[PDB]
Amino acid sequence: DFVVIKAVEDGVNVIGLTRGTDTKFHHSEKLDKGEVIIAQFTEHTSAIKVRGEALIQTAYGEMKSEK
Amino acid sequence: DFVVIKAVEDGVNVIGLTRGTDTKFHHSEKLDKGEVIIAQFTEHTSAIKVRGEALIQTAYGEMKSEKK
Amino acid sequence: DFVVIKAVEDGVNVIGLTRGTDTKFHHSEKLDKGEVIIAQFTEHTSAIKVRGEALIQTAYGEMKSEK
Amino acid sequence: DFVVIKAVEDGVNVIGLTRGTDTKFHHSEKLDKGEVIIAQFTEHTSAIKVRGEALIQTAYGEMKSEK
Amino acid sequence: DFVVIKAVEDGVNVIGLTRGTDTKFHHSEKLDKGEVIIAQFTEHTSAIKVRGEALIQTAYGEMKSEKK
Amino acid sequence: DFVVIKAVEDGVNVIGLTRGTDTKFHHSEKLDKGEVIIAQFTEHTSAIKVRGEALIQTAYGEMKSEK
Amino acid sequence: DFVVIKAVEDGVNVIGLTRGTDTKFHHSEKLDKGEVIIAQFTEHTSAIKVRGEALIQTAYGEMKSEK
Amino acid sequence: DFVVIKAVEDGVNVIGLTRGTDTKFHHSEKLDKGEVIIAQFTEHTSAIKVRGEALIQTAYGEMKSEKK
Amino acid sequence: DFVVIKAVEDGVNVIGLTRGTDTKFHHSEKLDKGEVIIAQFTEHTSAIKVRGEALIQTAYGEMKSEK
Amino acid sequence: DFVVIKAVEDGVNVIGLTRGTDTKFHHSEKLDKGEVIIAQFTEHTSAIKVRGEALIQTAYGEMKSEK
Amino acid sequence: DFVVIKAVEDGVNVIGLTRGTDTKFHHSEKLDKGEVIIAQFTEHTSAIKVRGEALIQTAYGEMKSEK
Numbered sequence: 001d002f003v004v005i006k007a008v009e010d011g012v013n014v015i016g017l018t019r020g021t022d023t024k025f026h027h028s029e030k031l032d033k034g035e036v037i038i039a040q041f042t043e044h045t046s047a048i049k050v051r052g053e054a055l056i057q058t059a060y061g062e063m064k065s066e067k
Numbered sequence: 068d069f070v071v072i073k074a075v076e077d078g079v080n081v082i083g084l085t086r087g088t089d090t091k092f093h094h095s096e097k098l099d100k101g102e103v104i105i106a107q108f109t110e111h112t113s114a115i116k117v118r119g120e121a122l123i124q125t126a127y128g129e130m131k132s133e134k135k
Numbered sequence: 136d137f138v139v140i141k142a143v144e145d146g147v148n149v150i151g152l153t154r155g156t157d158t159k160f161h162h163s164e165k166l167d168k169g170e171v172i173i174a175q176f177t178e179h180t181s182a183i184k185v186r187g188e189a190l191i192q193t194a195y196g197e198m199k200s201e202k
Numbered sequence: 203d204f205v206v207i208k209a210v211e212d213g214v215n216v217i218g219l220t221r222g223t224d225t226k227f228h229h230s231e232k233l234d235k236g237e238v239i240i241a242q243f244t245e246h247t248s249a250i251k252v253r254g255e256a257l258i259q260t261a262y263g264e265m266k267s268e269k
Numbered sequence: 270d271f272v273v274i275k276a277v278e279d280g281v282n283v284i285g286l287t288r289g290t291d292t293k294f295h296h297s298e299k300l301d302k303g304e305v306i307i308a309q310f311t312e313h314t315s316a317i318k319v320r321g322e323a324l325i326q327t328a329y330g331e332m333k334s335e336k337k
Numbered sequence: 338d339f340v341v342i343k344a345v346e347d348g349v350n351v352i353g354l355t356r357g358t359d360t361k362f363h364h365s366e367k368l369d370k371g372e373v374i375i376a377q378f379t380e381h382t383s384a385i386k387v388r389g390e391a392l393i394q395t396a397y398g399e400m401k402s403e404k
Numbered sequence: 405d406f407v408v409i410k411a412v413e414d415g416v417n418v419i420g421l422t423r424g425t426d427t428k429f430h431h432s433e434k435l436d437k438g439e440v441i442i443a444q445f446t447e448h449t450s451a452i453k454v455r456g457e458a459l460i461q462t463a464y465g466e467m468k469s470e471k
Numbered sequence: 472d473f474v475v476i477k478a479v480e481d482g483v484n485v486i487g488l489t490r491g492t493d494t495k496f497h498h499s500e501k502l503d504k505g506e507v508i509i510a511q512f513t514e515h516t517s518a519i520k521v522r523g524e525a526l527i528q529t530a531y532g533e534m535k536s537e538k539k
Numbered sequence: 540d541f542v543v544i545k546a547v548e549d550g551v552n553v554i555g556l557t558r559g560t561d562t563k564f565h566h567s568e569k570l571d572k573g574e575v576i577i578a579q580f581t582e583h584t585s586a587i588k589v590r591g592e593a594l595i596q597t598a599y600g601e602m603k604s605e606k
Numbered sequence: 607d608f609v610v611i612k613a614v615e616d617g618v619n620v621i622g623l624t625r626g627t628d629t630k631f632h633h634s635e636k637l638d639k640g641e642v643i644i645a646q647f648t649e650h651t652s653a654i655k656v657r658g659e660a661l662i663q664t665a666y667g668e669m670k671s672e673k
Numbered sequence: 674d675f676v677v678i679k680a681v682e683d684g685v686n687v688i689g690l691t692r693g694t695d696t697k698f699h700h701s702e703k704l705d706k707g708e709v710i711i712a713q714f715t716e717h718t719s720a721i722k723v724r725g726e727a728l729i730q731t732a733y734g735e736m737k738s739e740k
């Protein structure tokens with residue numbers, strides 16, 4: 001499955017956390033105002049963290065992260 | 068399957084419990100106010116605990132965890 | 136599948152029962168008031184018992200344990 | 203698949219019946235008033251019997267056992 | 270798949286019929302008034318019969334079996 | 338998949354027809370008035386015939402066989 | 405998947421046509437007035453024809469064959 | 472998957488088209504007025520053609536073929 | 540999965556395009572006025588083109604091609 | 607999965623992009639006004655572009671490309 | 674699974690991110706005004722970024738990226 005994230009303000013970060021015994025950030029994707037990323041869960045990513053002002057859509061609804 | 072968690076106050080803990088014969092915390096992710104984590108159940112994680120004020124969405128709807 | 140459990144009072148116990156020929160508790164997770172656990176059925180867990188005051192959500196609706 | 207059972211009064215019994223050519227009770231789980239159990243069908247359990255006053259939820263709706 | 274059976278009178282019988290070339294009763298579970306059984310179709314059971322007054326729920330809705 | 342058949346009169350027959358190149362009755366289950374059978378299609382049964390007054394429930398609705 | 409067929413009159417025929425390179429009737433089930441047959445598609449049957457006055461239910465609704 | 476076809480007039484044909492590199496008619500099933508056929512897609516049939524006056528039902532609704 | 544095409548006028552063509560590295564017409568089925576074809580995607584067909592006045596039904600609704 | 611595309615004007619192109627490490631046009635199908643193409647994703651095509659004035663249907667709803 | 678993207682202004686980019694331990698842009702697809710791309714998640718693409726004004730449709734509904 002995947003998540004849809006739209007940056008509402010500049011410098012939002014979409015961060016992938018490692019799948020496995022260890023849980024660490026493997027990548028932080030910077031999103032500028034207005035850009036959208038559609039990101040899956042994958043072999044390497046089993047949790048996604050969102051920081052900054054953004055709108056998130058999933059199967060379960062919408063959620064806004066805040067600055 | 069996955070859970071969506073938005074921190075409504077600072078220092079919310081998202082805790083992964085170990086899959087298998089033993090049940091112990093293998094990781095606690097700290098969220099500050101306004102941050103969101105989308106987390107799956109996995110080979111290593113078969114239970115997830117939320118401590119602190121947060122809005123939770125799952126297949127089953129919404130659940131609020133309360134202020135610490 | 137999984138169950139969502141929210142503790143309404145302090146001292147709620149979420150207990151996992153062993154999958155297999157034998158049925159014993161293998162783990163009791165204590166929840167404080169306001170905490171939420173999302174717990175799957177697994178290789179080792181085929182029944183979950185809730186004791187104490189709590190709100191439960193499953194694929195079939197909501198249920199309350201009391202006291 | 204699984205069933206959710208809330209005891210509405212004391213000494214509700216949730217009984218697992220053996221999967222296979224033979225059908226006997228392999229376990230009877232005592233449920234006190236206000237407690238909840240969520241139980242799966244499993245390698246060892248292919249029928250579940252509920253005795254006592256209880257609320258039961260399944261994929262097919264709600265049932266109340268009486269007594 | 271499974272069936273939900275609630276006995277509405279005493280002595281309701283929930284009968285499992287054998288899967289395979291032969292069709293015979295292999296087990297009859299007796300239910301007293303108010304008791305509930307949730308039973309699956311299995312390797313050994315491919316037809317289930319209810320005799321006696323009962324409410325049945327399946328993937329298809331409700332059916333009542335009548336008083337014996 | 339399965340069918341739910343309730344006998345509305347005495348002398349209802351639920352007949353299983355053989356799966357394979359040949360099509361023969363292999364079993365006729367006689368149902369008394371008010372009894373209900375829930376019968377699967379199986380390795381040995383690929384068609385089921387109902388004779389006598391009965392109510393049939395499937396995934397597609399309800400059908401009444403007539404006296 | 406399966407089809408439900410109810411004979412509205414005497415002399416309804418439910419015919420199975422062969423799966424494979426060839427399309428031949430392999431069996432015709434006679435259905436008398438009021439009788440119901442519930443028949444699957446199988447290894448041997450990949451088309452079913454109904455002749456006579458009858459009511460048919462499928463995944464796609466109802467259809468009436470005429471005498 | 473399957474399709475349900477009812478003949479509204481005589482001489483409706485239900486035609487199976489061959490699966491594979493070539494596309495030919497392997498068989499035409501004649502349906503007389505009021506008869507109904509329920510026909511699957513199979514190892515041999517990957518398209519179905521209807522000719523004559525008929526009502527067709529599939530997963531996506533109803534379609535009428537018309538003769539002449 | 541499949542498409543339903545009904546010719547509303549004479550000389551509609553239903554064309555199968557080849558699955559694989561190359562994309563060419565491998566077959567053009569001519570449909571006269573009033574005829575219907577139900578056609579699958581297959582090992583050999585990964586795109587279907589319709590030319591002429593016709594009504595099309597898919598899982599996603601109806602579309603009309605125009606002559 | 608597949609996409610349904612109807613040309614509302616002359617000159618619509620339906621373009622397949624290559625699956626794999628590289629992303630290149632492997633085929634451009636020209637659609638004239640009123641014609642429809644139903645196209646799948648396949649071993650060779652993992653993205654499809656539509657250029658010109660056309661009505662598009664997917665599992666997700668309707669979209670209009672502009673001239 | 675796939676996403677539908679329509680460019681509403683000129684010079685929109687649809688960017689694929691690499692599946693695997695590393696996260697890089699492997700390709701930017703230029704989408705000019707009014708054009709539509711329907712793009713899958715694949716062996717090589719596990720996240721998609723949109724830069725510029727566009728309408729996005731997914732299994733979850735609509736999202737707009739901004740100018």
Ligand SMILES: N[C@@H](Cc1c[nH]c2ccccc12)C(=O)O
Pocket residue numbers: 017018019020021022023024046047081082083084094095096106107108109110111112115
């Ligand atoms: N490394 C962890 C990451 C993770 C997924 N879901 C979680 C929930 C809580 C804590 C960590 C996680 C895992 O793959 O299991």
Ligand SMILES: N[C@@H](Cc1c[nH]c2ccccc12)C(=O)O
Pocket residue numbers: 084085086087088089090091113114149150151152162163164174175176177178179180183
């Ligand atoms: N180690 C346990 C964790 C767990 C999941 N669900 C539970 C319910 C109750 C108690 C523990 C659990 C297991 O994998 O089975």
Ligand SMILES: N[C@@H](Cc1c[nH]c2ccccc12)C(=O)O
Pocket residue numbers: 152153154155156157158159181182216217218219229230231241242243244245246247250
């Ligand atoms: N040890 C048992 C646990 C169990 C699951 N569901 C039950 C219902 C009733 C009694 C026991 C159970 C086994 O896995 O089956």
Ligand SMILES: N[C@@H](Cc1c[nH]c2ccccc12)C(=O)O
Pocket residue numbers: 219220221222223224225226248249283284285286296297298308309310311312313314317
């Ligand atoms: N041992 C039986 C238990 C059972 C399941 N469903 C039933 C219905 C009727 C009677 C017995 C059963 C079995 O595995 O098949």
Ligand SMILES: N[C@@H](Cc1c[nH]c2ccccc12)C(=O)O
Pocket residue numbers: 286287288289290291292293315316351352353354364365366376377378379380381382385
């Ligand atoms: N022994 C039979 C039992 C059965 C199942 N469904 C039926 C319907 C009708 C008659 C008998 C049956 C079988 O496995 O097929």
Ligand SMILES: N[C@@H](Cc1c[nH]c2ccccc12)C(=O)O
Pocket residue numbers: 354355356357358359360361383384418419420421431432433443444445446447448449452
């Ligand atoms: N022996 C036939 C039984 C059957 C199933 N569906 C049918 C429809 C019509 C006639 C016979 C049948 C078979 O297995 O295919």
Ligand SMILES: N[C@@H](Cc1c[nH]c2ccccc12)C(=O)O
Pocket residue numbers: 421422423424425426427428450451485486487488498499500510511512513514515516519
């Ligand atoms: N023997 C044919 C029977 C058939 C199924 N669907 C059809 C549609 C039209 C004509 C014949 C058929 C088959 O297995 O493919």
Ligand SMILES: N[C@@H](Cc1c[nH]c2ccccc12)C(=O)O
Pocket residue numbers: 488489490491492493494495517518553554555556566567568578579580581582583584587
């Ligand atoms: N022989 C072709 C038949 C076919 C199926 N669907 C079609 C659509 C158009 C043209 C031909 C076809 C194949 O199996 O692919």
Ligand SMILES: N[C@@H](Cc1c[nH]c2ccccc12)C(=O)O
Pocket residue numbers: 556557558559560561562563585586620621622623633634635645646647648649650651654
């Ligand atoms: N030969 C191509 C045909 C095709 C399918 N979908 C398309 C979309 C656009 C262009 C070509 C196609 C393939 O199998 O991939």
Ligand SMILES: N[C@@H](Cc1c[nH]c2ccccc12)C(=O)O
Pocket residue numbers: 623624625626627628629630652653687688689690700701702712713714715716717718721
């Ligand atoms: N060659 C790429 C094509 C592609 C699919 N989805 C995309 C999204 C963005 C950019 C490129 C693509 C692949 O198979 O992965």
Ligand SMILES: N[C@@H](Cc1c[nH]c2ccccc12)C(=O)O
Pocket residue numbers: 014015016017027028029039040041042043044045048690691692693694695696697719720
């Ligand atoms: N290379 C990463 C790309 C990715 C997918 N989803 C993500 C979410 C956050 C950060 C990176 C990603 C992966 O395959 O796992």
